[PDB]
Amino acid sequence: DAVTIRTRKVISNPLLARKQFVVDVLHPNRANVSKDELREKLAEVYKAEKDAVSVFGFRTQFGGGKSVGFGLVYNSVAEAKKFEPTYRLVRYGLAEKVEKASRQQRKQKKNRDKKIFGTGKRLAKKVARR
Amino acid sequence: ARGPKKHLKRLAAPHHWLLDKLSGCYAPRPSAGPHKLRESLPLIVFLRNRLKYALNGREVKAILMQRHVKVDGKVRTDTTYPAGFMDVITLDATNENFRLVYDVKGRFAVHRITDEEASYKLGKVKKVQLGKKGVPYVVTHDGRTIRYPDPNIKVNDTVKIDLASGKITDFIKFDAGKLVYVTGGRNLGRIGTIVHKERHDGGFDLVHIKDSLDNTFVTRLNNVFVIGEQGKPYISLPKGKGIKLSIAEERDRRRAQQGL
Amino acid sequence: LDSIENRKLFEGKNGAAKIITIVPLVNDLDPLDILYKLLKCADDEGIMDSKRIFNVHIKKFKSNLKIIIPDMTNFLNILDCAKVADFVVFGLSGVQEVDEEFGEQIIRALELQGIASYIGVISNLSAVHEKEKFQLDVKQSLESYFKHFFPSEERVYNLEKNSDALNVLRTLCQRLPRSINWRDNRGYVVADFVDFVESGDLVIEGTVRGIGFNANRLVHIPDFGDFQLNKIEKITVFESNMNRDTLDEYA
Amino acid sequence: PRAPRTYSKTYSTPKRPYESSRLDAELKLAGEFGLKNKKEIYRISFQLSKIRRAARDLLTRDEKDPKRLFEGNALIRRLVRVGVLSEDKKKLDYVLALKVEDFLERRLQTQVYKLGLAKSVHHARVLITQRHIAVGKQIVNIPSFMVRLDSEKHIDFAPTSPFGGARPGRVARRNAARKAEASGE
Amino acid sequence: KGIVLEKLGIESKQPNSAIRKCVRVQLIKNGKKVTAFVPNDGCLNFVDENDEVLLAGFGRKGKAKGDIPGVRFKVVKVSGVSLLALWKEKKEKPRS
RNA sequence: AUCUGGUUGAUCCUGCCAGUAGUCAUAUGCUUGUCUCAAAGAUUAAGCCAUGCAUGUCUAAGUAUAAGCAAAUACAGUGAAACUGCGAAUGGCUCAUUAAAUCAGUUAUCGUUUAUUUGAUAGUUACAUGGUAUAACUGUGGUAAUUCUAGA
RNA sequence: AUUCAUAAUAACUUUUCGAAUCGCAUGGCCGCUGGCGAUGGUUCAUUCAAAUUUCUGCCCUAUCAACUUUCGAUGGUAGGAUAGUGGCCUACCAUGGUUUCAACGGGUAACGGGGAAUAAGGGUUCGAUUCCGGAGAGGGAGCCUGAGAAACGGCUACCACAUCCAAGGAAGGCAGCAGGCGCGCAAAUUACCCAAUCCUAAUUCAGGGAGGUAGUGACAAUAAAUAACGAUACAGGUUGUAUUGGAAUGAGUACAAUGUAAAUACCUUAACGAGGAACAAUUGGAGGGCAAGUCUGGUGCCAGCAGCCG
Known part of the structure; x- marks a missing residue:
């Protein structure tokens, strides 16, 4: 059966160049709808580019048939890319996950460096001579 | 303690901010500034909780650092700057002005004003x-x-x-027959006219107030703020004009009228 | 002051070794795979071979261990090795069920002669993997089984996890064992070396563990019966003073 | 730390344990209404105890005392909404005369039996727990749900079940397949 | 909790006639010496000297209970296993 | 807003023992399928502690010749080390001591100090001065050993 | 309510402060003049605070009736010291101060309060512990820096413990988080993360075992499966007792999507998943108190039962 998408409590927000609203979805006879599908259908209704649309926070009603979530649409792809959190941009494929080392290893490195005064090019020579 | 304190636990925050119990362990501590801590309103509480323009403390800072917000005509960027009673807040985009003033329930209202009144x-x-x-x-x-x-x-x-x-x-001189606004204690947010004043040397003076329904009440002089002549405020008043209603009256008005 | 007094016997590199016996309850297991996984947590590859008794020093805990592996062919030999232990390590299989005619009888018998202390261990739990939640179903079943015989114990360790395997090793080093009443009111030693001298004389050296030895008392060896000793010496010498009793059964 | 979560106990135990006359009266209720426990009866008598306590207090106040008017009317309004109190008895002195059977009568389990749909209170309970009954659009699977007077018109089979119009269940489908396989020899 | 010193039988008070089974125990935390009753008949075979036992009060807030003169306590667990489980044959006891 | 069993040959009393219900009161035994929610080395020892972590910080805007990287002849992007400035007196843990002490409500400073925030506020006394100065850096070293540090 | 605020006169001072600083822009007038900001600085006010302070209020004890004043106890005058009041300290002087309306002494398995349990009403018992206030960092003393500390993830000494060593020396403080030993009736992982709440810094960006997430967890609390319905036979006023038949469903497993910092789980869902529905509910009792056996086998005042009567 047809999915029906409705938007509620629409607020325009010039301070962050976006519109923000509640998303309410009817979907009889299917489990739910993917965030990827919602972003495409919201893009055409608000005349936006797909990369400017962000959608999050869904739960489906007990007994099924309905879901509710939250949505944002930005005035441009450039503005979305600066105000949006990085973790969401990764979900959409607009950014790459950074390869930092684990939290405990980073802390242990810091504490070793605290024991060296200066830049340590000296001392390295001194140990080699010992 | 060996010095000043930097944190404010939730539950210890002022009740009129209407923060929920469970969303976190801490509350925003107001910076030192023009208004006392116990009776200020931090900007983060205004932008996030009242207007809903921001979802997070992180987003609030993104607004302030663009310099979109000014208080009494000056740009402020401290998240916990303590705005307070009678201050003017201006958002230039959206083109909105607000004056902080009390509800008859004793909370800061969202009261919009014209671009002219924002001058003073x-x-x-x-x-x-x-x-x-x-x-x-x-x-x-x-x-x-x-x-x-x-x-x-x-x-x-x-x-x-x-x-x-x-x-x-x-x-405007303090005198009998002036309009007053009550700014503290049990009667916070009511409006009326001065009947007369009691002198108590070495103690606290008391003032007798009458409202337009001719109910009468008493407050310490410390809590009284003069705002105009009889029937001529110098500022726009909030919706409901400071008239206190009994819980029975409130119940009727809602369900009979607005509740259709 | 009493707690120090008691721990002194194992105090350090001069102190006595704790005696560990490994007993696999299933023919599947091979006891040397258990010993291997333990020593990986010692963080010293220099610790880690066609023999069945091992001496080890774990510098990480300043601890001395003696490890005994019995030959699982000989039921009577299993009971003998356990009789001298401080800790018995029981190996359980996640794949194959314990046999009523042999595996159970080992446990039941060891209880009834007395046990100094016990640990339950698994080493092959990955062999049933589909997801880790399927492993935990099996582990809960084994804990219920083991607790039937040793109701003081509520946890069975999985040696395939570094944290568990390290947890076992620490226990063997740091914790004092229970006594065995009938054993410790006698003397006993485990032989380090044995040698013969000519009309015969047999020399043994080791470490005393029980109440102690006296050169006027008789000395039992389980397969050979009673014997008499002529000297004690400390590595002062204590000859048999012969104002003593002798190998006779009457009067 | 975060503020404490509040909670409370919702039932009370009788003080004489083996009183023969009480034991019989309770078992008659369980058989008539299809309950599983004595606890389900203790819950209702605990609620009714608090209602009487509140009303009994207000009746010591003067008439036209503002508190008696405000809180008294709210209490009555609330009991009429669920149909526990008749709209003819709309007075604080009749609140004291309520009894346990008046509350049991309003449970979803018994309403689904009075309406038809089910042929015993025991058949009714199974249907609810197995997700066949809906109240308006919402599926409800709790037997102790109290039916408000407006809701009674809207009790029916759920759209996503057999009896309600969906595909047959797992066992019906299995049988048809096996028969077709044998018939599709 | 205490250590079992020796095993005793106590003659019941008249008019009843029975030899009831008890043990001497030394409490670990005090060194004080006490006599405790062992319930459930043949259960006395499960306790032996230098076992460690957990004791509970005999229900009468420091008075002696029934026939038994001067006995104020009962055994609950021995060597870490409960006597009720042993008596019903639900667990097994290791020796030491 | 409720009680019942036990002193006698039998009775009415005084009186206690036992029974009965709860506990955001702890421990322990037997048993244990589902959803929401949730305390947790206080009691005895404010006893003793292996190992790792829990406090640092830069903007257009104090100091750059890294012999760093990346590509307007005094300099001009990015940026390690070090100097300078601010912070480390908040937070988190525990309950040993303490009986007009701490604490609660209510007062006072005409009896005193106050980084920071906010508002006011100094016509009155060379086209720009020193090293009575040094870190990082370069280079030569001591000690089994530490966030040791010397001479140039 | 003032010897208040403030102003004036004569001097003092080892002489306080009164811009030798930084970014962006490049306008006006015939080499002179100019804008928007950052950081510093004197004094007053304000804000976040601190110190001291008035009145009333506390558990058991007389097998504690007198206590304080040498060596400050109560008060007066002068000085010193302090940010400042005051026996806070010193010199001289006076002889006072508290108490049967319980002083002083002793005990507390005593941190205070908001509060908790049980209540017809009046009461009794508890509060180490999520918020507010106080104290401490093995035990005592002393002190540097600073607006603020008598700081302990700062220093110095002594007392008690205790680590490394080449034996000359060096280093130490988990009543922070996780973890170990001991103790005992008695209490969890040496895991993931700054996404949320907030805090600090020269700061939108860095950091945070504060805090959040998951693991262990029958402390306490809420909802709630373990079966429903026909036919046949027999009995009975539509209800019982036993041969037989189709339907319904989640416990569990799982493609997927959702959830989330990334995950696990909940909510949703394709496929699979009941006939001893083995997909088998326990814990205590059956003389009385106190719901419920004149049943049947065993045993020998013993083994045992028994809160009490037995």
Whole structure:
């Protein structure tokens, strides 16, 4: 059966160049709808580019048939890319996950460096001579 | 403690902010500034919880650092800057102005004002004295010091201040028959007219107030703020005009009228 | 002061070794795979071979261990090795069920002669993997089984996890064992070396563990019966003073 | 730390344990209404105890005392909404005369039996727990749900079940397949 | 909790006639010496000297209970296993 | 807003023992399928502690010749080390001591200090001065050993 | 309510402060003049605070009736010291101060309060512990820096413990988080993360075992499966007792999507998943108190039962 998408409590927000609203979805006879599908259908209704649309926070009603979530649409792809959190941009494929080392290893490195005064090019020579 | 404290646990926050119990362990501690901690409203609480323009503390900072917000005509960027009673807040995008004023329930209301009224604020006179070289000055409730007041100004009077320049333009004497706004205690947010004042030397003076439904009540002089003549406010009043209703009256109005 | 007094016997590199016996309850297991996984947590590859008794020093805990592996062919030999232990390590299989005619009888018998202390261990739990939640179903079943015989114990360790395997090793080093009443009111030693001298004389050296030895008392060896000793010496010498009793059964 | 979560106990135990006359009266209720426990009866008598306590207090106040008017009317309004109190008895003195059977009568389990749909209170309970009954659009699977007077018109089979119009269940489908396989020899 | 010193039988008070089974125990935390009753008949075979036992009060807030003169406590667990489980044959006891 | 069993040959009393219900009161035994929610080395020892972590910080805007990287002849992007400035007196843990002490409500400073925030506020006394100065850096070293540090 | 605010006169001072600083822009007038900001600085006010302070209020004890004043106890005058009041300290002087309306002494398995349990009403018992206030960092003393500390993830000494060593020396403080030993009736992982709440810094960006997430967890609390319905036979006023038949469903497993910092789980869902529905509910009792056996086998005042009567 047809999915029906409705938007509620629409607020325009010039301070962050976006519109923000509640998303309410009817979907009889299917489990739910993917965030990827919602972003495409919201893009055409608000005349936006797909990369400017962000959608999050869904739960489906007990007994099924309905879901509710939250949505944002930005005035441009450039503005979305600066105000949006990085973790969401990764979900959409607009950014790459950074390869930092684990939290405990980073802390242990810091504490070793605290024991060296200066830049340590000296001392390295001194140990080699010992 | 060995010095000043930097944190504020939730539950210890002022109740009129209407923070929920469970969303976190801490609350925003207001910075030092014009208004006392217990009776200020931090900007983060205004933008996030009242207007809903921001979802997070992180987003609030993204707004302020663009310099979109100014208080009494000056740009502020401290997340916990303490706005307070009678202050003017301006958002230039969206083109909106607000004055912070109390509900009859004793909460800060969202009250919009015209671009004209945003020019000025009222101030209660806290003391008047001679400064160095013999120059007189007044101190207002929000901590401004103004040089060379009119010789007739006395304590408990109210003064009209132009936000540009900062000079005094008018004043109203404390007297019987004036309108007053109540700013503390059990009767916070009510409006009425002065009936008479009780002198108590070495103690607290008491003031008798009557509202337009001719109910009467009493408050300490410390809590009284003069705002105009009988029936002529110097500022726009919030919806409901400071008339207190009994819980029975409130129940009827909602379900009978608005509840259709 | 009493707690120090008691721990002194194992105090350090001069102190006595704790005696560990490994007993796999299933023919599947091979006891040397258990010993291997333990020593990986010692963080010293220098610790880690066609023999069945091992001496080890774990510098990480300043601890001395003696490890005994019995030959699982000989039921009577299993009971003998356990009789001298401080800790018995029981190996359980996640794949194959314990046999009533042999595996159970080991446990039941060891209880009834007395046990100094016990640990339950698994080493092959990955062999049933589909997801880790399927492993935990099996582990809960084994804990219920083991607790039937040793109801003081509520946890069975999985040696395939570094944290568990390290947890076992620490226990063997740091914790004092229970006594065995009938054993410790006698003397006993485990032989380090044995040698013969000519009309015969047999020399043994080791470490005393029980109440102690006296050269006027008789000395039992389980397969050979009673014997008499002529000297004690400390590595002062204590000859048999012969104002003593002798190998006779009457009067 | 975060503020504490509040909670409370919702039932009370009788003080004489083996009183023969009480034991019989309770078992008659369980058989008539299809309950599983004595606890389900203790819950209702605990609620009714608090209602009487509140009303009994207000009746000591003067008439036209503002508190008696405000809180008294709210209490009555609330009991009429669920149909526990008749709209003819709309007075604080009749609140004291309520009894346990008046509350049991309003449970979803018994309503689904009075309406038809089910042929015993025991058949009714199974249907609810197995997700066949809906109240308006919402599926409800709790037997102790109290039916408000407006809701009674809207009790029906759920759209996503057999009896309600969906595909047959797992066992019906299995049988048809196996028969077709044998018939599709 | 205490250590079992020795095993005793106590003659019941008249008019009843029975030899009831008890043990001497030394409490670990005090060194004080106490006599405890062992319930459930043949259960006395499960306790032996230098076993460690957990004791509970005999229900009468420091008075002696029934026939038994001067006995104020009962055994609950021995060597870490409960006597009720042993008596019903639900667990097994290791020796030491 | 409720009680019942036990002193006698039998009775009415005084009186206690036992029974009965709860506990955001702890421990322990037997048993244990589902959803929401949730305390947790206080009691005895404010006893003793292996190992790792829990406090640092830069903007257009104090100091750059890294012999760093990346590509307007005094300099001009990015940026390690070090100097300078601010912070480390908040937070988190525990309950040993303490009986007009701490604490609660209510007062006072005409009896005193106050980084920071906010508002006011100094015509009155060379087209720009020193090293009575040094870190990082370069280079030569001591000690089994530490966030040791010397001479140039 | 003032010897208040403030002003004036004569001097003092080892002489306080009164811009030798930084970014962006490049306008006006015939080499002179100019804008928007950052950081510093004197004094007054304000804000976040601190210190001291008035009145009334506390558990058991007389097998504690007199206590304080040498060596400050109560008060007066002067000085010193302090940010400042005051026996806070010193000199001289006076002889006072508290108490049967319980002083002083002793005990507390005593941190205070908001509060908790049980209540017809009046009461009794508890509060180490999520918020507010106080104290401490093995035990005592002393002190540097600073607006603020008598700081302990700062220093110095002594007392008690205790680590490394080449034996000359060096280093130490988990009543922070996780973890170990001991103790005992008695209490969890040497895991993931700054996404949320907020805090600090020269700061939108860095950091945070504060805090959040998951693991262990029958402390306490809420909802709630373990079966429903026909036919046949027999009995009975539509209800019982036993041969037989189709339907319904989640416990569990799982493609997927959702959830989330990334995950696990909940909510949703294709496929699979009941006939001893083995997909088998326990814990205590059956003389009385106190719901419920004149049943049947065993045993020998013993083994045992028994809160009490037995």
